[model samples]
Target: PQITLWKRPLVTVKIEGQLKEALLDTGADDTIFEEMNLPGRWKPIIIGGIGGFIKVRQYDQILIEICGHKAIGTVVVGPTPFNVIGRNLLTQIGCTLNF
Candidate 1:
């Protein structure tokens, strides 16, 4: 289940039955998605990105499928230019950097 790093390391992820392309961003600490209707209660939080800080909703117990590997975890949703698969979900999927 190893993936090669491309220019942006883009990968297809299935979230809540929705398929989307996400960036495998190692520099990001948490996964962030574009605005979507997520299940369960979400907590308010702010995240700092390359463009500065943004208000986001933290959705817990999100089911995500990456490369046929399924994982349940938290995901942030907000006004993000990139759908990012960060270290949080990456670690759950056993992602490793091979130089």
Candidate 2:
């Protein structure tokens, strides 16, 4: 869907049957969610954000639903101010920026 750039692009996302709001961040390279308990194993890795570099958990093959569109990919769990749906998932949902 076409969106205006007046405000942050926030969208509803579902993970493991739970729903939450996330920002569609084109500037972000990876999808990162707030600290939470998730099934399966994850590897510890460090990532850099607008603030600074920090360690986070990387979970692969995680199923996520964005605005009713489903996709499976990597999800990073870390201390972020808010959940973000980055290019990794945005491409899966066929999201694009248009004037």
Candidate 3:
């Protein structure tokens, strides 16, 4: 779907059968979600963001449905200001920025 840059690019996403909203952040390299009890094991890792770096749990091969499109990739769990759908999954779902 085409998105305009007028406002924050937010979209509906489904994970583990739960519906939630997330930002389509092309600037982010990986997808990150808020603290949630997701299935399967995860590894503790540190990731860097705009302000600073923080430790987070990394889960692989997770299925995420964004705007009716399906993508399976790595998802990180941490304390983010908001949920973000990064290039990892965005590329899988054929999302591109057209200015």
Candidate 4:
């Protein structure tokens, strides 16, 4: 499915059997969610954001659906403006950059 990039690149996504809007952020290396009820042994990690380093919980092997495409990847839980679908999931979805 060809997704039209919007001002915020918002798209429908499903995770943990729940549907929500996610930001298709090519700039981000890993996908992250604002907050979710996912069961896992979360590993703490710090990542550099726009301002400074922020703490995040890394959940492994998460099932996610975007535009009917399903893929398993790591999901980072943290405080973000929106849920982001980053390069990790983007790569599996075969995203090509076109201006």
Candidate 5:
């Protein structure tokens, strides 16, 4: 599973892999990862659930500046129910969808 962030996306991010009550939706263009999965990287998170109040993140991810044309962001780790990347990002980057 490899995700490349380009054009310098402005969004939230994290890197949590073990979650019992966490929700991750790739439908979101923002880079978000779990906090409980890191020690120093572990951020304090208070985000809302899927059907509850809007969850809030604690720490802001350190935006990575890539050489040439690339960058790195946080990735919400847990149980993913989908094996697809949302096409909305295409609109963000203005990419042509080829068939």
Candidate 6:
């Protein structure tokens, strides 16, 4: 049987220093990146926006290669490291993952 990850578009994302493959998810809205996914001594901090504050950590942006293209994106830390691709990264590219 196949695993049911998401019913939305899916692409392949990349990270540096360790993992080279990540799942690009368009279903993830607002989520940037996950913590612990980064390498070296990188600690994520909390950042607040107009809609109140959430645990938004910061990490060095990486060149995400997906759908035969690449984009610079920042990684956000989360309790659970989930590689979710959002519209912010998808709109620029001309590819869609239909589940």
**What's the count of clashing pairs in each model shown?**
0, 0, 0, 0, 11, 4
List, residue by residue over 1-99, the lDDT tens digit for candidate 6. Answer: 132554633445555533434455555443365555554344556644445555765555545666557666556666434466555566555546545
TM-score of 4: 0.90
Question: Order of candidates by TM-score, top first?
Answer: 3, 2, 1, 4, 6, 5
lDDT of each: 0.90, 0.90, 0.93, 0.87, 0.32, 0.53
- Residue 50 in model 1: shift from native, Å? 2.3
Give the better candidate number (1 or 3) by lDDT: 3
lDDT by residue (1-99, candidate 1, tens digit) is 566765678888899999999998889999999999889999999999666999999999899998788888899999999899889889988888987
Clash pairs for candidate 4:
none
- Deviation in angstroms for 47 in model 4? 1.4
Q: Please provide, for model 3 over 1-99, each residue's C-alpha lDDT reduced to its tens digit, 9 standing for 90 to 100.
A: 678888989999999988889999989999999998788899999999778998999999999999999999999999999999999999999998775
Q: How well does each candidate superpose onto the true structure, as a TM-score?
A: 0.92, 0.94, 0.96, 0.90, 0.27, 0.50
Off by over 4 Å in 6: 1-10, 20-23, 37-54, 96-99
Clashing pairs for predicted structure model 3, backbone only = none
Q: Across residues 59-89, which tens digit of lDDT does each residue of candidate 5 receive?
A: 3332322211223334333333321112222
Per-residue lDDT, model 5, residue 96, is 40
Candidate 3 displacement at residue 69 in angstroms: 0.4
Q: Whose TM-score is greatest here?
A: 3
Candidate 6 matches the true fold with a TM-score of 0.50
Ranking by lDDT: 3, 2, 1, 4, 6, 5
**Lowest summed-lDDT stretch of 10 residues in model 3?**
1-10
Between the candidate structures 2 and 4, which one is better when assessed by TM-score?
2
Off by over 4 Å in 3: none
lDDT of 5 at 72: 33
Who is ahead in TM-score, 3 or 4?
3
Candidate achieving higher lDDT, 2 or 4: 2
Question: Least accurate stretch of 10 residues (summed lDDT) in model 6?
Answer: 1-10
